[PDB]
Amino acid sequence: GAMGSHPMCKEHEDEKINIYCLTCEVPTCSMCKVFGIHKACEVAPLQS
C-alpha cells in the first residue's frame, strides 16, 4: 500500500512490511528474510 499508510520495517526503514513469517507468526519484511533474522523461516507474501 501507499507510503504513509503501509508500516515500514524497523530494521529496514525503506522496506514495507510485506511478508508474514509463518515460523515466528509475525509480519516482517523481505529483506529480513533474505539477509536478516528470518533467513531460516517459512514465510508467505501478505499480498497486494
Add this chain to the structure above:
Amino acid sequence: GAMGSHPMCKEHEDEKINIYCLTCEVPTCSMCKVFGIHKACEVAPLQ
C-alpha cells in the same frame, strides 16, 4: 524529466530494486529472491 526516484521491480511493482544477484549479475528485488526467479541465486544488498 524528473528528479530521482527508486527503480521498481517489473515483476513486483510495489518492490524497490534493492538487491544485486551476484549469480545472474543483475540488479533485482528482494521478492524475486524470496519467491521469484532468483530464489536459487546468491544475492547482496545494494545498500
